[PDB]
Every structure is written in structure tokens, then in C-alpha cells.
Amino acid sequence: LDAVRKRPGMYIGDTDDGTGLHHMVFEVVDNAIDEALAGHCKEIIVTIHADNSVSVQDDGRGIPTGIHPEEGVSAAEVIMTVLHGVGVSVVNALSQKLELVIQREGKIHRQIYEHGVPQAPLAVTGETEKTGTMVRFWPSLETFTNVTEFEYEILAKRLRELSFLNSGVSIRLRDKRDGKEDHFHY
Numbered sequence: 386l387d388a389v390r391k392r393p394g395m396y397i398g399d400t401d402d403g404t405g406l407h408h409m410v411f412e413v414v415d416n417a418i419d420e421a422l423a424g425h426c427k428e429i430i431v432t433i434h435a436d437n438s439v440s441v442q443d444d445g446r447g448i449p450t451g452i453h454p455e456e457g458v459s460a461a462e463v464i465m466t467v468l469h470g471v472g473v474s475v476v477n478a479l480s481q482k483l484e485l486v487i488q489r490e491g492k493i494h495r496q497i498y499e500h501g502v503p504q505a506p507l508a509v510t511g512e513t514e515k516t517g518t519m520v521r522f523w524p525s526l527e528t529f530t531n532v533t534e535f536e537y538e539i540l541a542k543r544l545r546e547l548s549f550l551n552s553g554v555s556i557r558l559r560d561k562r563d564g565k566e567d568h569f570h571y
């Protein structure tokens with residue numbers, strides 16, 4: 386990930402005018418949409434949190450959790466930390482904190498990253514009936530300058546375009562700073 390850290394603008398877009406900041410959300414959403422498509426209920430939820438973080442939840446099958454034979458760590462960690470849209474590893478690299486929650490095969494798995502560094506191995510923390518993947522990220526204020534807060538209408542505009550393109554995927558957008566919400570479903 387150091388190539389990303391070295392030149393984040395080259396991977397995510399402009400880090401001073403809000404372009405890169407919002408693209409961070411869009412990269413995660415792309416992956417959530419892929420996940421949602423391959424599931425039954427096909428809903429994603431994008432939440433803008435009061436502390437200037439964003440979460441994206443899908444109801445898909447959960448991304449794989451088993452050990453990657455070559456890399457020797459969970460497949461989820463390979464996704465989050467190996468360079469492959471630019472990939473969610475870029476998002477993780479430029480997040481001062483990132484929380485991953487995977488619900489799969491009857492189990493909840495959790496893992497925390499800081500600046501793309503895992504704080505511990507992906508771990509089973511409980512049991513569950515549901516499936517899905519949730520990422521919540523705090524963009525690094527060392528990288529993102531000037532425009533450091535998420536603009537609702539920028540997210541809403543893109544999510545609307547996406548709903549037409551991904552028919553039958555339900556997209557919910559929630560702003561916890563002011564109660565604003567939307568529901569895009571074509």
C-alpha cells in the first residue's frame with residue numbers, strides 16, 4: 386500500500402477539492418453493489434455518520450473469510466491490503482480508521498484497520514443468521530484537506546445514477562447529521 390500513500394491523488398483523485406473524498410465512498414459502494422447483486426434481497430445502505438465517517442452495508446453473502454493460501458492471511462485482509470475502479474485497498478490505505486464487519490456462514494467477523502494497517506487478524510466475534518458485509522471508514526485528515534466533510538447531494542447524485550444502472554438493487558442513503566434520507570430503487 387505504500388505506493389498509494391506516496392501519491393494518493395494518483396489513485397483516488399484530487400485530495401483538496403472533495404473529489405477524492407467522495408470517490409472513497411463510491412469505490413466501497415461499487416463493491417457493495419457487486420455483493421448485493423449476487424444475493425437475494427439486493428439492498429445497500431449508505432450512512433453518513435455524525436463524526437464525518439461513512440458506512441456502507443450490503444445484504445450479500447459476505448466476502449470470503451478463509452485463509453488465502455498464497456498470502457497466509459484471511460482473504461478479506463488480502464482484499465483490504467493488496468493492490469488489484471481502484472479497489473477498496475486504496476480506500477483503506479487513506480482511512481485513518483476502517484472497520485470491517487462480515488456476516489457469513491453463521492458467524493460475525495470483525496477487524497479494524499488504521500491507515501491501512503490491520504490491528505489484529507480478522508476474528509470471529511459471534512453468531513448470526515444474516516449475511517453481508519459492512520465497512521465503516523474515517524477518511525484520513527492527513528490526506529484529505531480543505532473539503533473534509535461529506536456533501537450529501539454529491540453522494541445522492543451518484544447513487545441515483547447507480548440505481549438506474551443496477552436495476553433491482555435498492556439503495557438507501559442516510560445522513561445522521563441532519564436526518565436527511567433517500568431511497569433509490571429503479
Ligand SMILES: NNc1ccc(Cl)c(Cl)c1
Nearest residue numbers: 416417441473518519520
Ligand atoms: N459494504 N460492502 C462491501 C462489499 C465488498 C467489499 Cl470487498 C467491501 Cl470492502 C465492502
Ligand SMILES: Nc1nc2ccccc2[nH]1
Nearest residue numbers: 390481499500501502527
Ligand atoms: N497517523 C498516521 N499516518 C500513518 C500513515 C501510515 C501508517 C501509519 C500512520 N499513522
